[PDB]
Structures are given as structure tokens and as C-alpha cells.
Amino acid sequence: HHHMSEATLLSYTKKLLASPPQLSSTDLHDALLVILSLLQKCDTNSDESLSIYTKVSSFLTALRVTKLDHKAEYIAEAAKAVLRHSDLVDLPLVILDIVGTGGDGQNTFNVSTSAAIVASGIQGLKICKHGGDLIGTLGCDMFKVNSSTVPKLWPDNTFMFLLAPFFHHGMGHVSKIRKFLGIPTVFNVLGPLLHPVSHVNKRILGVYSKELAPEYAKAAALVYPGSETFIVWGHVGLDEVSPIGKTTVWHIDPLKTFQLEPSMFGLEEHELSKCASYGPKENARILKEEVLSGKYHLGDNNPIYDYILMNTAVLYCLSQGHQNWKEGIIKAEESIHSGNALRSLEHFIDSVSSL
Amino acid sequence: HHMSEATLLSYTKKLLASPPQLSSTDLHDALLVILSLLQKCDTNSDESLSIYTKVSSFLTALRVTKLDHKAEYIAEAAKAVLRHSDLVDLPLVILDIVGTGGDGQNTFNVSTSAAIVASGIQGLKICKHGGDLIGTLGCDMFKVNSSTVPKLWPDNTFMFLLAPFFHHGMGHVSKIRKFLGIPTVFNVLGPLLHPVSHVNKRILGVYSKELAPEYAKAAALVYPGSETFIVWGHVGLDEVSPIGKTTVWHIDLKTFQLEPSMFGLEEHELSKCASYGPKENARILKEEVLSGKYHLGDNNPIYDYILMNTAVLYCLSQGHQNWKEGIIKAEESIHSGNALRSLEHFIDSVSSL
Structure with a gap:
């Protein structure tokens, strides 16, 4: 029961299927870390890869239909999750x-x-x-x-x-x-x-x-x-x-x-x-x-x-x-x-x- | 070829519209495309990953819109699945x-x-x-x-x-x-x-x-x-x-x-x-x-x-x-x-x- 797993992603998808959806902006941030983990580590041609693409597809589609991915806090939390896999530039002190x-x-x-x-x-x-x-x-x-x-x-x-x-x-x-x-x-x-x-x-x-x-x-x-x-x-x-x-x-x-x-x-x-x-x-x-x-x-x-x-x-x-x-x-x-x-x-x- | 990923995708886009534009007969046709596409997925090839991605997306969008919990859509979906079924022929409680x-x-x-x-x-x-x-x-x-x-x-x-x-x-x-x-x-x-x-x-x-x-x-x-x-x-x-x-x-x-x-x-x-x-x-x-x-x-x-x-x-x-x-x-x-x-x-x- 690792946190970075299909089981965690799945539990996030089911929150989006709820009436109304129970996925927080924080939850979206976490779901995306899970997605990026699953897809970084996916064994080419594994059954697991087909299952991961199934669940990632499901999650991202459900997000789009709820339209939560067009709300400020959700977009911001999503940007921050993607940036945890980014190389940021380190500079000294318009x-x-x-x-x-x-x-x-x-x-x-x-x-x-x-x-x-x-x-x-x-x-x-x-x-x-x-x-x-x-x-x-x-x-x-x-x-x-x-x-x-x-x-x-x-x-x-x-x-x-x-x-x-x-x-x-x-x-x-x-x-x-x-x-x-x-x-x-x-x-x-x-x-x-x-x-x-x-x-x-x-x-x-x-x-x-x-x-x-x-x-x-x-x-x-x-x-x-x-x-x-x-x-x-x-x-x-x-x-x-x-x-x-x-x-x-x-x-x-500002x-x-x-x-x-x-x-x-x-x-x-x-x-x-x-x-x-x-x-x-x-x-x-x-x-x-x-x-x-x-x-x-x-x-x-x-x-x-x-x-x-x-x-x-x-x-x-x-x-x-x-x-x-x-x-x-x-x-x-x-x-x-x-x-x-x-x-x-x-x-x-x-x-x-x-x- | 009508039974294609492109046809499936065009049905998914109807579910993404506000309000959804997918009819009951559209769901019937989408399910025939899906049953056709899924027979071609005998391996974990890139083409199977792609098809599984579009079927997942379509079925997930249908669930969220809740059209799959409407009588007319359920009936059309049962009809589509039955087109791939063995039916029993019997003479005339x-x-x-x-x-x-x-x-x-x-x-x-x-x-x-x-x-x-x-x-x-x-x-x-x-x-x-x-x-x-x-x-x-x-x-x-x-x-x-x-x-x-x-x-x-x-x-x-x-x-x-x-x-x-x-x-x-x-x-x-x-x-x-x-x-x-x-x-x-x-x-x-x-x-x-x-x-x-x-x-x-x-x-x-x-x-x-x-x-x-x-x-x-x-x-x-x-x-x-x-x-x-x-x-x-x-x-x-x-x-x-x-x-x-x-x-x-x-x-x-x-x-x-x-x-x-x-x-x-x-x-x-x-x-x-x-x-x-x-x-x-x-x-x-x-x-x-x-x-x-x-x-x-x-x-x-x-x-x-x-x-x-x-x-x-x-x-x-x-x-x-x-x-x-x-x-x-x-x-x-x-x-x-x-x-x-x-x-x-x-x-x-x-x-x-």
C-alpha cells in the first residue's frame, strides 16, 4: 500500500465522481505527484503500464469534466506539483x-x-x-x-x-x-x-x-x-x-x-x-x-x-x-x-x- | 474506417461540451467503436496504450456526466453490447x-x-x-x-x-x-x-x-x-x-x-x-x-x-x-x-x- 500507487490515484479519481466532487486543490497537487511517479517508473510494455495509462486517462478526463482544473487554487496547486519534477534555475542576488x-x-x-x-x-x-x-x-x-x-x-x-x-x-x-x-x-x-x-x-x-x-x-x-x-x-x-x-x-x-x-x-x-x-x-x-x-x-x-x-x-x-x-x-x-x-x-x- | 480512435475521440468531445452533446444513439455507436478497438489490443503496444487511454477517457467522461445512469442510455448501451452476443433462437410464466x-x-x-x-x-x-x-x-x-x-x-x-x-x-x-x-x-x-x-x-x-x-x-x-x-x-x-x-x-x-x-x-x-x-x-x-x-x-x-x-x-x-x-x-x-x-x-x- 505505497502512497505513490495506482490505489492512491484511483481514490482521487473516485472523489471527482462524487456529487459534488470531494477533490481539494491540495488533493489535485497530491494526485499529480502520484501520476508523475507512476509514469516516470512505468515498465515499457508491462500490464501495469496499460493499467497506469487507464487510470491517468480516467483521472485527467474526470478533472476536465468537473472543470475544477480551471479554478485558481487548482491551477496553482497543479503548477506546483509539476514544478517538483522541474529543474529550477539558481541565480545570485526589470x-x-x-x-x-x-x-x-x-x-x-x-x-x-x-x-x-x-x-x-x-x-x-x-x-x-x-x-x-x-x-x-x-x-x-x-x-x-x-x-x-x-x-x-x-x-x-x-x-x-x-x-x-x-x-x-x-x-x-x-x-x-x-x-x-x-x-x-x-x-x-x-x-x-x-x-x-x-x-x-x-x-x-x-x-x-x-x-x-x-x-x-x-x-x-x-x-x-x-x-x-x-x-x-x-x-x-x-x-x-x-x-x-x-x-x-x-x-x-501587487x-x-x-x-x-x-x-x-x-x-x-x-x-x-x-x-x-x-x-x-x-x-x-x-x-x-x-x-x-x-x-x-x-x-x-x-x-x-x-x-x-x-x-x-x-x-x-x-x-x-x-x-x-x-x-x-x-x-x-x-x-x-x-x-x-x-x-x-x-x-x-x-x-x-x-x- | 469509421471504427477508429478518431471516431471514439469525437464522441468523448461531445461529453466534454456544456451541456453534453452525446445522444443515447451516439452512446450506442461509441460502444460499437470501443468493442471493435478493444479486440485489436492483444499486446501492451503503444497502439494499445493509446486505445486504452481513449476508452478510459470516454467511459470516465460518461460516468461524470451521469448519462450512463439514464434509462435511454442504459438501453442503447445494452443494445450495442448485444450486437457482439450469441442469441438463442426458440420456436414462437x-x-x-x-x-x-x-x-x-x-x-x-x-x-x-x-x-x-x-x-x-x-x-x-x-x-x-x-x-x-x-x-x-x-x-x-x-x-x-x-x-x-x-x-x-x-x-x-x-x-x-x-x-x-x-x-x-x-x-x-x-x-x-x-x-x-x-x-x-x-x-x-x-x-x-x-x-x-x-x-x-x-x-x-x-x-x-x-x-x-x-x-x-x-x-x-x-x-x-x-x-x-x-x-x-x-x-x-x-x-x-x-x-x-x-x-x-x-x-x-x-x-x-x-x-x-x-x-x-x-x-x-x-x-x-x-x-x-x-x-x-x-x-x-x-x-x-x-x-x-x-x-x-x-x-x-x-x-x-x-x-x-x-x-x-x-x-x-x-x-x-x-x-x-x-x-x-x-x-x-x-x-x-x-x-x-x-x-x-x-x-x-x-x-x-
Whole structure:
């Protein structure tokens, strides 16, 4: 009767089958440790492996239908359980991240990585973007960036990119069953909450739905207590600040909300159809050759350019503690045309190639 | 290919919607996909891990939505499973008695015992379907199948059908039910899979008061020609309980309540009415009960337990609530030797096929 067993997992599942469910946020934390234990230790092709996948499937599905996995305390407890299997970065004694939950069913351009690179070219900003390929096509092996090498890179880089799978081994254990399940689970909303560097003190966290946003705001406050945080939801169904129509922002100011519109940044609206992803190789070429090269300017109404510039502007106003969106657009524009943003990126690529 | 993981997944997504978009006929179609997929899982390959993941997910989502506890869904699910079953063909009062299980109890096989005693009462024919106990009495139960039941039918007052030899569908889901460890729709299908259409009365035990009324309606959809008692013992028992009260649901809707005192019997704790496994259960039934060693008034718990369940069968067969007359007829069936001969005629009938 070991605690890390199918029998314990099963007892947690049965709490979720109750009317009403009797699974606490604490219980979810414990269930996830059990799941990660079972799946880390599962003997390939054992009967036990088929039984474990059965029970893990059962548990995660039951969680999704109860919808308890979209409540702040549950999301936070789930993030903390996954982090117990993560390599966290240890650093000595303004630093921003930008990332979305995914799940908006939108195949739009990688604006988060782009805006993270342009923001890092602005004097006074440091960007430690966490997520996940785009940045791997540029000529650096992202597998080299891990808990033991991030401290080497930290002092001399305005821009850093952390590929999630090389930190969160717990996510790696559930990867295959997540593919088999083919349905959303608690895991689909945890990514933005797993930042392995405690020194990040400001972030933009995009969410796919209006309903999730207020609970996500409360979860972000529990996981990143020291952080000033924008939760963002584009009204067309987007986990970023949208190039068309309005975006709502939930403001964690250690709950105030305000609406964003491209007209506020001094930009024309652009359909999502004009901001498509072309896949990592081509997106990287667009970013480096169309955007970081300074080929396009504010006022050309290039949609992907405008999309990056706006998301940089928000990242900048967040950093400076004001809502002067046009000033953010000025600063993002300057970081591109001064060649600072491309220098920031190239410095990080060169740093990574030296490991 | 419609019978694919992708088809299964699309049904699961209907259960995840608010509100759920999975119809009763959708559940029927989902279960056919599941029975198809689970036959392909002969090894612990990645493809079996994937399929087991999607079947678990679908059955778990169905449980949480509680659609599997609705009459129309239970009926459609029984219909889907039956598509993989051997059905008995017979030419143009016949009773069954069986419980859903899943009450967490380990009580004597009263349903097979009362089926035998009832089969010794003139005018009653019993075709009990379930499951071993009869297997241990020098009877090759494998020989009782779709081809042989029509040969045994005419000159047997008692017949026993071993469910697993008829319902190949239930065979394919057996491993994943053990692995899941939670109740699913499959926990309530056994009683609704009787392969002989001619059965026109039955007692169907359920484990759950909450499930009971919806199960009564399911029974009426699956067995529209049957007068049916659904029974639930208040202690949590899919039988007419030898202790405390039992609630009975009646379909041609109607509810009444049973208590051992109404049979002029004493109450016995479930500890006194325990199962000993098939071999010893069969020996108690043959040597202590069908032999007439015990009488009404001996207060022998297994004997009383069997008398009560036989009395209810008898009252159902005749359409009255004269429970003490039921006792009299059950007692007469045992002590006349009618019950033992009825069983012995079946066992020899099977032995000689």
C-alpha cells in the first residue's frame, strides 16, 4: 500500500465522481505527484503500464469534466506539483516574460518570441522568454540551454529563451498520454506558470478564453507572488493582444481591467488571416529578414510588423508602470531601426553556441 | 474506417461540451467503436496504450456526466453490447433473477438458489442468466450455448445460462474494467443481456437507490414484454435483503417495500448470509438446502435468505403480494424434492448433450 500507487490515484479519481466532487486543490497537487511517479517508473510494455495509462486517462478526463482544473487554487496547486519534477534555475542576488496558454485554435505568427526579442533591445529591459523551434532555426541548439547553463548566459544577455521541455521533466512524462488523450487537460494551461527563473518580476500571460482569464489572474498571483502581471485575451479568441478588434487585460498590481485596440497604438487593424504562422523556419526568416533587419517601418501597415510592434509596446509600458501605448510603439520602433533588437538576439545565439 | 480512435475521440468531445452533446444513439455507436478497438489490443503496444487511454477517457467522461445512469442510455448501451452476443433462437410464466453487482457486498448466491427452488413450483419455468456454482456440480456449463438451449428448453423447469459464453462483447472490455477500478455503464448491462426473448418476468437487483428508477425504465425499454421487479436492499444490496428493508420498483412506475417480518422470517446480518465461493456455495445449496435438512422455523440464515427470494419470485409470477403464500410454495418446492429434481433434470440434460 505505497502512497505513490495506482490505489492512491484511483481514490482521487473516485472523489471527482462524487456529487459534488470531494477533490481539494491540495488533493489535485497530491494526485499529480502520484501520476508523475507512476509514469516516470512505468515498465515499457508491462500490464501495469496499460493499467497506469487507464487510470491517468480516467483521472485527467474526470478533472476536465468537473472543470475544477480551471479554478485558481487548482491551477496553482497543479503548477506546483509539476514544478517538483522541474529543474529550477539558481541565480545570485526589470525582467519580463511573455507567453500564452495556447488552445485558442489559432495558427497565428510567433509574436511572443518576436516581441520578446524587440523588447530586449530597449535600454532598461531584460527578457527571459519561456515557452515551446523558431529560435532553434536561427543557428543555436536550444537543448544546450538548461538549469546549469542559464546562470552562465544570465549576466551578459538582454534576451534569453528557455525551451520548456529541457526544464520540466514532469511535462515530458505526460507528453505521450496527452497526445493519446487528444482532449484538453489541466496540463494545457500550466506552461505560462512554469517559469524556472524566480528573478522574472513582470510578465504578459495570454489565455484562450474570457472565462479562464479571471481564475488565471488569481493563479498567476499565487504562483508568481512578487510579479506585476497582465493577463490578456483577444476578443476574437486569441491568447495575445489581437491585431483585430479588442483585447481585455486583467491587471495584477501587487482586479483592475482595461481594453486594448490597435487604434490606441496608432495602428490599422489586421485580420488574423494576414498574421498566419508559416512554420518555424519561415517565421524565423520573416522575423530576422523582414522585421529585425528594419526593412519595414511604423506606418507601412505591414501586418506581422505591426503585430510585433504592438505586443512590444505593451511589454514596454508594463515594464515602466504606465499605459503610454504610443511611447511603447516609439521605443519598440527605435529598438528595431537602431539594430539593437537584432544585436540582442545575435548576442544570445552566440552565447548559446559557446556552451 | 469509421471504427477508429478518431471516431471514439469525437464522441468523448461531445461529453466534454456544456451541456453534453452525446445522444443515447451516439452512446450506442461509441460502444460499437470501443468493442471493435478493444479486440485489436492483444499486446501492451503503444497502439494499445493509446486505445486504452481513449476508452478510459470516454467511459470516465460518461460516468461524470451521469448519462450512463439514464434509462435511454442504459438501453442503447445494452443494445450495442448485444450486437457482439450469441442469441438463442426458440420456436414462437418464464422467470429470471439477477443483480447488477457493484454493491461492494460478498453475499451468498441467493439468485441462482431461489431460481432453482422457484423452478420446482408447478407453473413456473426458470431461465436464470448470469455469472461456476452449477459448474462445480458435475456440469460442463460450456455445453450450454445458443445451439443447445433450444434442445434443453422443452423438458427443463430450470435452465442456467453462463453470461460469459454468450456475451463476447463483455469479454473485450473485461481487462479495462479491472484497470479502471471505477463503475462504468458496463456495471449495469449484465441483467439486460438475457439471450432468450421468451422470458416474460424477472427480478433485477441494483446496488444504488438513485439508479433504481432509471434502471426500471431501462428494463422496460430492453424487455418491453416483461413484468419486472427492480430491487434494492437499504443496506446497499442488489437482492431482497435478509436484514432491514428492501424497496421494489414495479413495471407492467410503482414502488413498495419489503421486510423479512412480512415473510414471517427473522432478520439475519449480511455476515450470516456470506458467499464462500462457487464450490462451497454449491455444496451448501445441494447438501443443506435442496436436501430438506432445514425447514421454515429453523432460522437458518442461508435457508431463510433463499426462501424469501423464492417467495418474491413466486408472488411476481402470480401477480399478487401474498408473501407468506410465496414462503409456503418455496418450502413445498424444497421438502417435496421438486427443487432438487428440477436441478438434477437440468444437470443430467447438460451432461448428456
